[PDB]
């Protein structure tokens, strides 16, 4: 049991190191496969685009202190280091909305109280490093044993729903700013419809090529090779399609040029821990502990839940995972980066899931039978390193990246969001709310429990998810991780009383 | 055996009358079903739109002698009479391209001969009536027993392919006349993309609602009721969507106003056989026999092949079909109508198939089983009569019909064309050309015949179909029926020599 209290200092870290490191040379040898290259190509864009979007947003919110170049450098460096020395290379680390909310709140607080914005973050990082070291020393990462399925399912469903909603909402603004009237360009004709056509075409091509993979046409080898290259093929096809058109205007991908800070007139690479232009008050030296706890809670919750989700026994992960080394590495890297004015990073989730399930191999299921069961996942240390390296050097190139419209990427994002719902018991039980009781499948949680009890369980889960979404939307969005943690006591106290033992084992089974 | 030489004069007609008429009151009592109303709504537009398009084309080709109003009246009257007294009410009577080609050729011939056009189309009708009576008297309709599957499959596939190609080509002209530039309408912005969006949306909504019918969601009754109303729902949804948009211009459905001739200044309802402005030469009175034979061959071939296709034993038609009464009625109506200047009509293959397979009922199948087998077809005499009556009076209304864009109808036409390919062995054997030999299904023409022989048979069929299409495209398009008839001797002579008896029985099975 990896999540066992050894009883000795740094015991969990040492156990993880001995468990994972022996299979080191095998990690790099398992990269000889076309699926690896397809995964690299697919994940490069998924990692790059959010970096640019969030960098633009962060630059807009702050007074041009953190922009896009800093975010790109931070992502590249942290990803490279984590994939070189991490224990779970199937994790993609990048900005997250909660981080943006916290950064904006901290900037507002500093402006209100007349304090430097890039000086407090250094002390926040110092406190974060100290807290991570203290927690790893005491083996406090064993508490993940109490994060059951009732929380992982809610987290995954909420993340996927938010992803889909954001992708859909990014397209309404194009119609709002380019209305259909007829007679930084604004008010252009033939733009809002061309964007929609491009996005729909990309999505449908990707979906069709995914379906063709499991079909009975063509030889098996060629069919599988083409099926695993669907996303690049769709991207290439519609990029060419929009390139053919000449007079219409579409928004392109914008990547800054030059490895330099956004505002060199008032910034530098190295930030003095003390005041840079005026003395830093001492009272803030020790008062920085409070935001450090919040940042640590956010990062820990996100990373641990993502690692739990991508390590389910249904998925065939053979080399093993580690909950101690990964957290230490991520928190230390985040704390150290603040000394250079770079933002913090954490495991993505949707990107991590799309990366993990893009390397899976499905076994033949004969003519009849259920959906083919997972055979292997093919983990290695080459894909993530390559993705991070490519994202880091996306500045030297960028003339080619300027010929790619954003509407094409919106379809890929929608395809990523829709396919991430597969493998969640909550989603599968949501279908049963519409099917008649005689058509329910032969799963364990169907024969051993009554239909009404399962429906009540699903309704309670939906209520919790709706409450979490409502909390996130409200201005008090910094308390989301705290509200998420409350699900564990809920399951431990209320659900045990409401439901019987057999029902709880059947619905909330570990495997 | 319906196709048996009775010997007695007019024996086939009498046999058909006694076989079909007894089940008369049942035809009108089987119309109490929501599926009947759904079929009526679906088929109304499919019948109306081609009438308008072909009427416009005919008016353009001739000097405004036959237009749209005459075609509408002819369709309505002939449909009503045929459905009231016909033996196979599952047939839809409407113009056909070959008829347009023949009409244009006849007009061109009469133009450079100093001869009338409408006067010359009365003797053709007289000769057609005489020929139909002579053939029915001698029981010459028994020859349809030599038309095997090798010809029906080719005919059906060619008709469906031409339908799909025409529907797709109707959309390229919109882009050609409304190019994307940006700055009797012409050169408008946002018009070529809105039409594409509307067509795609209509098609996809119809397809999704069709798939939802066979799913496991919702109660069976509600699911089936919603599934059989997919086309009207799609039409309504996008008509509303297009109506919401204000200033963008789209082409609407246009129908003439008033029950009057297109060119009253130089035409009338009744045409004098002797002449209208100048005496009609006698030499042409007896020379009209030649075009009469060609028209008779066209109508006979089309109607007989359509009746054969819709009467396959795979489909469950229990009330019986008639090959003599139907042909007699159709030819007599076509000949008589020419006396009033109205065009001839014939059964429509695609419309007839879509009508027949829109009234079918599917039985419940096994979860790990094949597609459900057909249970019944639910034939009656109310749907076709209602469709003809509605098309006839589509002139009093038309303010409502002017709010329906054509791009919406293009999607319905594409859906009709794609779904018509189901049930053809030639189409099913085309998939096998791509599947590996180990995945071929468990059918009789797979186990009893070596794969290469079946592929050779499919290749020969494809060669014949390509030759027929090439002949149709070429200017010498009036010889298409003659080329089609040559397939029967080909099958009787060459295929028998090339292939063995055992292979021929399996590949060319009657049932």
Q: How far is CA A2 from the centre of its chain?
A: 24
Please tell me whether residues A445 and A381 are part of one structural domain. no
User: CA of B32: how far to CAs of A195, A328, B11, B27, B37, in Å?
Assistant: 47, 73, 35, 10, 9
Classify residue A218: in a domain, yes or no: no
Contact by Cβ (8 Å): A348, A75? no
What's the token pair of residue A279?
Answer: 């003395």
Contact by Cβ (8 Å): A438, A291? no
* Any A CB within 8 A of B198 CB: no
* Any A CB within 8 A of B247 CB: yes
Q: Which residue from B332, B263, B197 is spatially nearest to A198, judged by alpha carbons?
A: B197
3-state secondary structure of B393: coil
Contact by Cβ (8 Å): B216, B227? no
Please tell me whether residues A345 and A475 are part of one structural domain. no
- Taking an 8 Å cut-off on Cβ atoms, the answer to whether A182 and B188 are in contact is yes
**CA–CA distance, A352 with A73 (Å, rounded to integer):** 20
A381 Cβ neighbours under 8 A, 6+ residues apart? A27, A28, A31, A83, A84, A89
- Residue B343's DSSP bridge partners are none
Please tell me whether residues A378 and A279 are part of one structural domain. yes
**CA–CA distance, A142 with A4 (Å, rounded to integer):** 6
Q: Which residue has the tokens 């599988």?
A: A224
What's the token pair of residue B5?
Answer: 């030489």
Residues of B in contact with A200 (CB under 8 A): 200
Contact by Cβ (8 Å): A178, A191? yes
3-state secondary structure of A252: strand
Helices (H), A114-191: 117-137, 149-177
**CA–CA distance, B103 with B91 (Å, rounded to integer):** 23
Helices (H), A338-419: 350-356, 383-392, 406-419
* Any A CB within 8 A of B223 CB: no
Give the chain A residue nearest B219 (alpha carbons).
A436
Q: Residue A442 sits in which domain range?
A: 424-511
Classify residue A85: in a domain, yes or no: yes
**CA–CA distance, B224 with B214 (Å, rounded to integer):** 8
Contact by Cβ (8 Å): B231, B358? no
Given phi > 0 = left and psi -120 to 50 = alpha, else beta, which region is A10? left
| B234–chain A nearest CA distance, Å | 18
- Residue B362's DSSP bridge partners are B374
Give the chain B residue nearest A193 (alpha carbons).
B193
Q: Which residue from A455, A456, A460, A462 is spatially nearest to A437, judged by alpha carbons?
A: A455
Contact by Cβ (8 Å): A352, A306? yes
**CA–CA distance, B488 with A147 (Å, rounded to integer):** 74
Please tell me whether residues A432 and A402 are part of one structural domain. no
Classify residue A190: in a domain, yes or no: no
- Candidates B436, B437, B446: best to mutate against A (most CBs of A within 10 A) is B436
- Candidates B171, B174, B183, B190: best to mutate against A (most CBs of A within 10 A) is B190
Contact by Cβ (8 Å): A259, A269? no
Q: Which residue from B307, B424, B305, B285 is spatially nearest to B355, judged by alpha carbons?
A: B307
Contact by Cβ (8 Å): B383, B39? yes
**CA–CA distance, B361 with B339 (Å, rounded to integer):** 42
Phi/psi of residue B223, nearest 5 degrees? -60, -45
What's the token pair of residue A293?
Answer: 């706890």
Interior angle at CA B325, CA B324 and CA B327, nearest 5: 65
Classify residue A495: in a domain, yes or no: yes
- Taking an 8 Å cut-off on Cβ atoms, the answer to whether A194 and B193 are in contact is yes
What element of type H or E holds B329?
A: helix B325-337
Q: B77-104 as b/e, with b when 16 or more CB fall inside 10 Å? A: bbbbbbbeebbbbbbbbbbbebbebbbe
Rg (CA), chain A: 24
- Taking an 8 Å cut-off on Cβ atoms, the answer to whether B439 and A180 are in contact is no
Phi/psi of residue B374, nearest 5 degrees? -70, 135
Classify residue B474: in a domain, yes or no: no
Classify residue A175: in a domain, yes or no: no
**CA–CA distance, B158 with B161 (Å, rounded to integer):** 5
**CA–CA distance, A105 with A99 (Å, rounded to integer):** 10
Please tell me whether residues A42 and A144 are part of one structural domain. yes
Q: Which residue from A71, A133, A69, A135 is spatially nearest to A103, judged by alpha carbons?
A: A71
* Total domains in the fold of chain A: 2
Residues of A in contact with B188 (CB under 8 A): 182
- Taking an 8 Å cut-off on Cβ atoms, the answer to whether B182 and A188 are in contact is yes
* Any B CB within 8 A of A371 CB: no
- Taking an 8 Å cut-off on Cβ atoms, the answer to whether A194 and B197 are in contact is no
B162-170 long-range contacts, Cβ below 8 Å, gap at least 24? Answer: B162/B469, B162/B472, B163/B350, B163/B413, B163/B416, B163/B417, B163/B420, B164/B414, B164/B417, B164/B418, B167/B410, B167/B413, B167/B414, B167/B417, B168/B414, B170/B410
Contact by Cβ (8 Å): A360, A376? yes
Please tell me whether residues A66 and A156 are part of one structural domain. yes
User: CA of A253: how far to CAs of A49, A66, B229, B423, in Å?
Assistant: 8, 20, 44, 48
Contact by Cβ (8 Å): A424, A156? yes
Residues of B in contact with A247 (CB under 8 A): 180-182
Q: Which residue from A459, A493, A70, A122 is spatially nearest to A271, judged by alpha carbons?
A: A122
Please tell me whether residues A392 and A502 are part of one structural domain. no
Dump the DSSP string for A66-82: S-SHHHHHHHHHHHHHH
**CA–CA distance, B357 with A289 (Å, rounded to integer):** 73
**CA–CA distance, A288 with A270 (Å, rounded to integer):** 20
Please tell me whether residues A352 and A451 are part of one structural domain. no
Give the chain A residue nearest B439 (alpha carbons).
A216
Residue A88: CB atoms within 10 A of its CB come to: 27
Count of residues in chain A: 511
User: CA of A413: how far to CAs of A166, A231, A255, A419, in Å?
Assistant: 10, 11, 19, 10
| A246–chain B nearest CA distance, Å | 9
Contact by Cβ (8 Å): A109, A318? no
Binning chain A into helix, strand and coil, the percentages to the nearest 5 are 65, 0, 35
* Any B CB within 8 A of A436 CB: yes
B472-481 long-range contacts, Cβ below 8 Å, gap at least 24? Answer: B472/B162, B477/B98, B477/B101, B478/B98, B478/B101, B478/B102, B478/B105, B478/B294, B480/B98, B481/B98, B481/B297, B481/B298, B481/B301
**CA–CA distance, A291 with A109 (Å, rounded to integer):** 11
3-state secondary structure of A405: strand
Classify residue A216: in a domain, yes or no: no
Please tell me whether residues A400 and A297 are part of one structural domain. yes
3-state secondary structure of B374: strand
What's the token pair of residue B356?
Answer: 């027949």
Query: Which residues in chain A are followed by a discontinuity, with C-to-N distance exceeding 2.5 angstroms?
Result: 183
- DSSP letter at B491 equals I
- Taking an 8 Å cut-off on Cβ atoms, the answer to whether A190 and B190 are in contact is yes
| B10–chain A nearest CA distance, Å | 54
Residue B510: CB atoms within 10 A of its CB come to: 9
**CA–CA distance, B241 with B233 (Å, rounded to integer):** 12
**CA–CA distance, A431 with B320 (Å, rounded to integer):** 44
**CA–CA distance, A330 with A129 (Å, rounded to integer):** 10
Dump the DSSP string for A469-501: HHHHHSS-GGGHHHHHHTHHHHIIIIIHHHS-H
Phi/psi of residue B233, nearest 5 degrees? -65, -45
**CA–CA distance, A209 with A38 (Å, rounded to integer):** 14
- Residue A347's DSSP bridge partners are A93
Please tell me whether residues A383 and A458 are part of one structural domain. no
Contact by Cβ (8 Å): A197, B193? yes
**CA–CA distance, B52 with B44 (Å, rounded to integer):** 13
- Residue B346's DSSP bridge partners are B94
- Taking an 8 Å cut-off on Cβ atoms, the answer to whether B194 and A193 are in contact is yes
Q: Between chain A and chain B, how many beta carbons pairs sit less than 8 Å apart? A: 61
**CA–CA distance, A449 with A430 (Å, rounded to integer):** 16
* Any A CB within 8 A of B171 CB: no
Indicate the burial class of B329 (C-beta count within 10 angstroms; 0-12, 13-18, 19 or more): buried
Helices (H), B178-288: 192-213, 220-227, 230-244, 283-287
Q: Given the DSSP bridges, would you call strands B361-362 and B346-347 parallel, antiparallel or unpaired?
A: unpaired
Alpha-carbon torsion (A294, A299, A305, A308), positive or negative? negative
**CA–CA distance, B330 with B345 (Å, rounded to integer):** 8
Please tell me whether residues A290 and A142 are part of one structural domain. yes
Please tell me whether residues A393 and A506 are part of one structural domain. no
Question: Experimental method for this entry?
Answer: cryo-EM
* Any B CB within 8 A of A221 CB: no
3-state secondary structure of A347: strand
A314 Cβ neighbours under 8 A, 6+ residues apart? A374, A423, A511
User: CA of B174: how far to CAs of B189, B251, B320, in Å?
Assistant: 12, 10, 45
Helices (H), A325-382: 325-337, 350-356
Classify residue B79: in a domain, yes or no: yes
- DSSP letter at B405 equals B
Helices (H) and strands (E) in chain A, counts: 23, 4
Contact by Cβ (8 Å): B317, B2? no
Q: Helix A230-244 to helix A406-419 angle, to the nearest 10 degrees?
A: 160
Residue A373: CB atoms within 10 A of its CB come to: 11
């Amino acid at each position: 049991d990896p999540l066992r209290r050894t009883g000795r200092p740094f015991g969990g870290l040492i156990r993880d190191v001995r468990r994972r490191y022996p299979h080191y040379l095998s990690d790099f040898r398992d990269a000889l496969d076309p699926q690896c290259l397809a995964a690299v190509i697919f994940i490069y864009f998924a990692a790059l685009s959010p970096a640019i979007t969030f960098g633009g947003l962060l630059g807009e919110k702050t007074q041009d202190l953190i922009g896009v170049s800093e975010l790109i450098m931070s992502t590249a460096l942290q990803g490279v280091v984590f994939c070189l020395l991490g224990a779970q290379p199937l994790l993609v680390i990048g900005f997250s909305g909660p981080l943006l909310v916290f950064e904006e709140a901290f900037f507002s607080f500093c402006s209100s109280n007349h304090l430097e914005y890039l000086v407090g973050r250094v002390w926040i990082g110092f406190w974060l490093v100290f807290l991570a070291l203290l927690m790893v020393a005491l083996e406090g990462s064993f508490l993940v044993r109490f994060v059951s399925r009732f929380t992982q399912e809610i987290f995954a469903f909420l993340i996927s729903l938010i992803f889909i909603y954001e992708t859909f909402y990014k397209l309404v603004k194009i119609f709002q700013e380019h209305p259909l009237h007829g007679c930084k360009p604004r008010g252009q004709p033939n733009t809002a419809l061309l964007s929609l056509v491009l996005m729909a075409g990309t999505f449908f091509i990707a979906f069709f090529l995914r379906k063709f993979k499991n079909s009975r046409f063509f030889p098996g080898r060629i069919r599988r090779v083409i099926g695993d290259f669907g996303v690049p093929i769709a991207i290439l096809i519609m990029v060419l399609v929009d390139y053919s058109i000449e007079d219409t205007y579409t928004q392109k991908l914008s990547v800054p040029s030059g490895f330099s800070v956004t505002a060199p007139e008032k910034r530098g690479w190295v930030i003095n821990p003390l005041g840079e232009k005026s003395p830093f008050p001492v009272w803030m030296m020790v008062a920085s502990l409070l935001p450090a706890i919040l940042v640590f809670i956010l990062i820990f919750m996100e990373t641990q839940i993502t690692t739990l989700i991508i390590s389910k026994k249904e998925r065939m992960l053979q080399k093993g995972s580690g909950f101690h080394l990964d957290l230490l590495l991520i928190v230390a890297m985040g704390g150290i980066c603040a000394l250079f004015g770079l933002p913090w990073l954490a495991a993505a989730t949707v990107r991590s899931v799309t990366h993990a399930n893009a390397l899976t191999v499905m076994s033949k299921a004969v003519a009849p039978g259920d959906k083919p069961k997972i055979q292997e996942v093919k983990e290695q240390r080459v894909t993530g390193l390559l993705v991070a390296l490519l994202v880091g050097l996306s500045i030297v190139i960028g003339d080619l990246l300027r010929q790619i419209p954003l509407a094409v990427l919106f379809g890929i994002f929608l395809y990523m969001g829709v396919t991430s719902l597969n493998g969640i018991q909550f989603y599968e039980r949501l279908h049963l709310l519409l099917m008649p009781p005689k058509h329910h499948p032969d799963v364990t949680y169907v024969k051993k429990v009554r239909t009404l009890r399962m429906h009540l369980f699903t309704a309670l889960q939906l209520l919790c998810l709706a409450l979490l979404w409502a909390v996130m939307s409200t201005a008090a969005s910094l308390a989301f991780p705290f509200i998420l943690i409350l699900t564990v006591p809920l399951r431990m106290v209320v659900l045990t009383r409401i439901f019987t033992d057999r029902e709880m084992k059947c619905l909330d089974a570990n495997e």
